Amino acid sequence: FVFNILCVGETGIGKSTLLETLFNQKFDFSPKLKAVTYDLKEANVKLKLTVVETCNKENNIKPVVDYIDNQFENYLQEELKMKRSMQAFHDTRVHVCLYFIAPTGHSLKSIDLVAMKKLENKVNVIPVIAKSDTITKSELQKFKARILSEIQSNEIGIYQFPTDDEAVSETNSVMNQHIPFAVVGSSEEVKINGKTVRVRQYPWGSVQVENENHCDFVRLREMLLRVNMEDLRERTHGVHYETYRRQRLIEMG
Amino acid sequence: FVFNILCVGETGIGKSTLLETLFNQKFDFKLKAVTYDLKEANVKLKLTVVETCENNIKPVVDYIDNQFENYLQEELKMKRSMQAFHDTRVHVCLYFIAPTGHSLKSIDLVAMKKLENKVNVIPVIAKSDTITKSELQKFKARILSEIQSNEIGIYQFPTDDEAVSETNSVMNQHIPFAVVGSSEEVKITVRVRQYPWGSVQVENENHCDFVRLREMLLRVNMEDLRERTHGVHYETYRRQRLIEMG
Numbered sequence: 001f002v003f004n005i006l007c008v009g010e011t012g013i014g015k016s017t018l019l020e021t022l023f024n025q026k027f028d029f030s031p032k033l034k035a036v037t038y039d040l041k042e043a044n045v046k047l048k049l050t051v052v053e054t055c056n057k058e059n060n061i062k063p064v065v066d067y068i069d070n071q072f073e074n075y076l077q078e079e080l081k082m083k084r085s086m087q088a089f090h091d092t093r094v095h096v097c098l099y100f101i102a103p104t105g106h107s108l109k110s111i112d113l114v115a116m117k118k119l120e121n122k123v124n125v126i127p128v129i130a131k132s133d134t135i136t137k138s139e140l141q142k143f144k145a146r147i148l149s150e151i152q153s154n155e156i157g158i159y160q161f162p163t164d165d166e167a168v169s170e171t172n173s174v175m176n177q178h179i180p181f182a183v184v185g186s187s188e189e190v191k192i193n194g195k196t197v198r199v200r201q202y203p204w205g206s207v208q209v210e211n212e213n214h215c216d217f218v219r220l221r222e223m224l225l226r227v228n229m230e231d232l233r234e235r236t237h238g239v240h241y242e243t244y245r246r247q248r249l250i251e252m253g
Numbered sequence: 254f255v256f257n258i259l260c261v262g263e264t265g266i267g268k269s270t271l272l273e274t275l276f277n278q279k280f281d282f283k284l285k286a287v288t289y290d291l292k293e294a295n296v297k298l299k300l301t302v303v304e305t306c307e308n309n310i311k312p313v314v315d316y317i318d319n320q321f322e323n324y325l326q327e328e329l330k331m332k333r334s335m336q337a338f339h340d341t342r343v344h345v346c347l348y349f350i351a352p353t354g355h356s357l358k359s360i361d362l363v364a365m366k367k368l369e370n371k372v373n374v375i376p377v378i379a380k381s382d383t384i385t386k387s388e389l390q391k392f393k394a395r396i397l398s399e400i401q402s403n404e405i406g407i408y409q410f411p412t413d414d415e416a417v418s419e420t421n422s423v424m425n426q427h428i429p430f431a432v433v434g435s436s437e438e439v440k441i442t443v444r445v446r447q448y449p450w451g452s453v454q455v456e457n458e459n460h461c462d463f464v465r466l467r468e469m470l471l472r473v474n475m476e477d478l479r480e481r482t483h484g485v486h487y488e489t490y491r492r493q494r495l496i497e498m499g
């Protein structure tokens with residue numbers, strides 16, 4: 001069982017930190033693009049985590065689109081082989097793209113609108129507000145609204161969690177309500193009541209990553225539920241990869 | 254007595270909020286300005302804000318040059334009255350660096366390098382409540398290191414006069430200033446930025462360097478910034494223009 005996550009955003013926006021927080025694990029990244037492959041034990045999940053720093057508005061997202069196209073191409077070439085073995089092929093197709101929006105507190109940059117528009121039919125895009133401890137509660141409500149307004153206005157097809165299966169439709173419907181996720185990451189941890197907890201400690205107080213009243217990290221983490229990973233994978237295989245495949249089959253003649 | 258402040262940085266980085274915090278006044282502002290008559294210490298200020306993003310720093314250089322040009326044209330007039338002329342030359346530029354936590358952006362080096370002989374540049378770390386105290390030390394160190402290795406002439410408060418050397422040496426030690434701006438007040442009367450996990454007190458030297466930045470407004474420091482604007486930066490402009498004009 002594979003799960004492939006791509007994080008996109010400007011340098012120092014907190015992408016690597018969020019991945020480590022999400023999996024509670026320091027990752028040794030390897031070669032503006034880097035990736036790690038990591039096995040979860042007792043979960044039977046093989047992860048490929050990929051990080052891409054963005055900065056020529058259309059050129060900005062090109063390296064990301066190319067990476068994505070390449071994982072599709074590798075899978076297509078395997079499907080087409082006479083002597084194929086689809087089990088034992090490592091499927092690296094990107095199941096989810098976390099798009100990191102900087103916390104200016106204003107709105108979506110024009111560059112981010114173009115990027116998410118170019119990605120929408122290539123990958124399941126989930127926009128997140130990076131370093132959301134930067135923003136006060138009232139500023140955040142307004143910021144989230146304006147971002148959503150622009151996504152809707154520009155007809156950008158971001159991912160939505162499935163709400164069809166009655167349980168847990170509840171969990172999923174509330175996740176959708178929180179998009180774009182206000183995320184906080186941290187390498188720093190303290191033991192609290194015998195439990196390991198990630199925090200950002202300032203002179204005036206500490207942001208608790210796993211506290212839902214501080215940020216949406218706990219809501220983002222529910223994407224890792226088996227049912228949600230499956231929906232993201234199925235949508236990748238049956239929709240985005242198929243779009244790629246159809247265009248390629250025409251080109252191959 | 255006039256004092257003219259320019260804030261430069263990317264949109265939404267806290268420029269207008271910081272001006273409001275510096276002067277404890279809500280202001281109603283490409284580039285925008287406001288004129289503030291600080292009847293406190295009898296000073297008229299022009300506060301200018303320019304949104305950036307080598308062509309990137311151009312609107313700023315042009316703005317600065319235009320104030321120099323107006324002053325020069327006045328100095329050259331047959332019927333001149335230099336007193337009661339409104340000097341709008343920029344006395345200090347607060348250059349906002351984004352709190353990424355890593356280093357100085359290449360764009361910022363180029364911008365500061367271009368501005369160094371046009372205006373007194375003071376780099377500030379915007380929204381410094383974004384950064385923990387431990388990373389903030391390293392971040393400041395890395396910025397200063399790039400500024401020095403790139404031979405960038407940022408402003409330094411004067412320390413040759415004992416009447417102010419203690420205050421000003423402490424100021425210099427905190428550059429680039431870790432700033433935080435505020436639009437709210439609590440009882441605790443305290444100006445704050447309030448989060449669920451605690452409140453930043455902008456006027457508290459343990460939370461940020463706002464109180465240190467504010468000492469720029471001491472009479473002696475405004476005077477030094479002005480004198481250097483007039484005797485150094487304006488002269489550099491003047492000499493070039495006199496060569497051009499013949």
Ligand SMILES: Nc1nc2c(ncn2[C@@H]2O[C@H](COP(=O)(O)OP(=O)(O)O)[C@@H](O)[C@H]2O)c(=O)[nH]1
Nearest residue numbers: 011012013014015016017131183184185354383
């Ligand atoms: N305020 C804040 N800072 C963060 C957060 N996440 C990471 N940082 C800091 O931002 C800096 C860059 O983070 P990093 O994960 O390397 O950024 P990347 O270049 O996007 O991979 C580091 O100093 C982090 O400690 C966050 O959620 N809030």
Ligand SMILES: Nc1nc2c(ncn2[C@@H]2O[C@H](COP(=O)(O)OP(=O)(O)O)[C@@H](O)[C@H]2O)c(=O)[nH]1
Nearest residue numbers: 104105134264265266267268269270380433434
């Ligand atoms: N975290 C943080 N946010 C700030 C600070 N100062 C201002 N803000 C917020 O940043 C957003 C944009 O600030 P603003 O002053 O209008 O930026 P400007 O475009 O550069 O003039 C607003 O939501 C402010 O409330 C600060 O020191 N720290």
